[PDB]
Amino acid sequence: IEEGKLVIWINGDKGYNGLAEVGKKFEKDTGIKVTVEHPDKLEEKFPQVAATGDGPDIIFWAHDRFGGYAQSGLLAEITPDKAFQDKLYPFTWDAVRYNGKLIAYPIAVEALSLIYNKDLLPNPPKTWEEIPALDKELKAKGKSALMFNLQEPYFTWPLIAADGGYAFKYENGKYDIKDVGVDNAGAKAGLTFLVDLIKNKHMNADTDYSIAEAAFNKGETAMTINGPWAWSNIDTSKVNYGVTVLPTFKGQPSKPFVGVLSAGINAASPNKELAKEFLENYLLTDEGLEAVNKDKPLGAVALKSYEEELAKDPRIAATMENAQKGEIMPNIPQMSAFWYAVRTAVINAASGRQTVDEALKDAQTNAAASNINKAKVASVESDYSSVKSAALSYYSDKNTMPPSGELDALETYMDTLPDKADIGGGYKLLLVNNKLALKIGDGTAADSVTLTKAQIEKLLSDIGPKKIYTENTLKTELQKNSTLKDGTLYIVLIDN
Ligand SMILES: OC[C@H]1O[C@H](O[C@H]2[C@H](O)[C@@H](O)[C@@H](O)O[C@@H]2CO)[C@H](O)[C@@H](O)[C@@H]1O
Structure with missing residues (x-):
């Protein structure tokens, strides 16, 4: 710079x-x-x-x-x-x-749309299922029905999601990074249809962005799938084009990520x-x-x-x-892993390097958290970060720390107010000396945290040193083999 x-x-x-x-x-x-x-x-x-x-x-x-x-x-x-x-x-x-x-x-x-050549196809298909028959008619004229980028999962996702595939499940204002839908019946139905299109030579597994664009803009294929950025180059070409709703699959709408x-x-x-x-x-x-x-x-x-x-x-x-x-689209850090996972699945399934079932099984493993305990920690980190930001706004406006008590003190600074930690325990605010701390758990069997050493490591790494304490005067820091005997955590949100 x-x-x-x-x-x-x-x-x-x-x-x-x-x-x-x-x-x-x-x-x-x-x-x-x-x-x-x-x-x-x-x-x-x-x-x-x-x-x-x-x-x-x-x-x-x-x-x-x-x-x-x-x-x-x-x-x-x-x-x-x-x-x-x-x-x-x-x-x-x-x-x-x-x-x-x-x-x-x-x-x-x-978002992606169906783009079609009105001179080859005066009426675009309403369904994915009628695309093979269109292709057979168009092949008679030395043309093809559909070409789009098969190297980027963004373009195949609308079909995968149509019958029930999803990335991360959204619940109570948060994404669950263990709960991924790339391997359910819906995702498999969508990817199987795509692979059948390729196996029946309606599409080619090697087709990339440049190939699909060239073919559509030269009038060689009746349809493509692309976003608004593509309209300019179609304008420059001789193609009379329309932009419309994606076809349905098994009677349900295509679901492009936005x-x-x-x-x-x-x-x-x-x-x-x-x-x-x-x-x-x-x-x-x-x-x-x-x-x-x-x-x-x-x-x-x-x-x-x-x-x-x-x-x-x-x-x-x-x-x-x-x-x-x-x-x-979610904006969470795990999206990168999701996209690598689905890219690999689509490329391997399309090229015949993996069956559809194997491709998505592997994709679910690659896209989701390694285990539910890691997903729990990610959830608590999300909660902590949101509460911190809210407490900082409170401070700057009242020139006081929030009162020790309910998290409701910070209510109008958040929209979804956290109620309970996924690692166990409820949230409270705990003002000590010059620090405001987020208290998690209350030392009862019904309301307290449990952490594995793996979880403790992750928290420490992700949140940092001298932030997590196991007692209410912030003396003893959380450490790898901590027993967490009393089942309570204190995480500093603000210090002066
Ligand atoms: O294919 C995975 C890819 O999808 C999205 O990227 C899109 C992008 O959003 C569009 O603006 C356009 O550039 O096409 C891209 C796909 O080639 C995600 O945004 C991206 O993170 C992801 O890797």
Whole structure:
């Protein structure tokens, strides 16, 4: 990185030339140079070079990766003023909130749609099941029915989820990282259908993003599956295209994962204030978003005033319809493991390196926590982090620590207030000397924590040294072979 200039990373399928135009307008006004790059494997390179203390000032990606980035301390907390926050749709803010803290600026909502060539297929299929028969007719003309990227699980997920597959189960405001649905009957039905399409030579296992795009834009295939960013290149081509709802599978809608394109600020950037100025006052304005959108369509933008302006576009209506039937992606750190797991399953099943049953069995193992005890610890870490953030807001506003007692003191600073720890025990607040601590458990058989040594290690590693105590004056720290005889934990949320 370099002070006095901004470097921005964004994926190559997005409108980086339009973003560069916003950067030039920024440079005009402020003299600060903005350089937009689009590295390969962007989402993997960032966490290596950021952990280093380098990388871009600003990173763009869908929101699902950002929880991992935040957990690793790679991201600067973002603090938009209330009036700025009011300019963006609340559900897009929700996508970039991680344990009570905003960790990026939301930009736009994307979901996959069915894109079809109206000159080859005046009426698109309503069902996946009728696609083999379409392909047979089209083969007669030297064409094919459908081509889309089979190397990225994002594109095959809508079909996998249709009959019941899911990533992480959501319950009581939290994701369960043990409860993964990649291996149920629904996921198997979806992936089996895909593999049958390939076995019957309706599709090719080697088809990647570039191959599918070239084929559709040259008029060689009647349909593809892609997001709003792709519409630009279809515009430039001679194809008369429509954008519509994904086909149903076994009578149920396809369920694409919904992504919110987001911009995060590198925690090691010496340019955070410049980065904040650029994002809030240049990019996230009608003119800034128009420049990006004119280059490669964003989808349904997060900025209310501009979303209204574009809302009549039938292609955006179709995007929103598919997004409605799908699910918002979790942003939790375990998403990276989920995506690696499903990529491997889809590639191996498609190429014949694993049967469908074997591929998904392995995928469930790869995607889910190793065991329920680890999932319990992740849950308690989530609770702790959320309560901490809430207690910090309480302090800054009252210039007092919360009262020792119920967690309800922090109620209006959270929405989902934690009631009970998954490791056992209830939550209370416990003010001691200069510290506010989260008390877990109350020393009774019915209300107390149990921790294995494995769990104790994980907590210590994940939460850090001198934070977890086993007695109410915060003398004795939790340690590997602690008996936890009294079944109570004290975790410091704030110290002065
Ligand atoms: O395929 C796994 C991949 O899916 C998503 O990535 C999308 C991205 O959200 C879209 O904006 C577009 O760039 O296509 C990508 C897939 O090639 C997840 O966001 C990503 O984390 C995940 O690895």
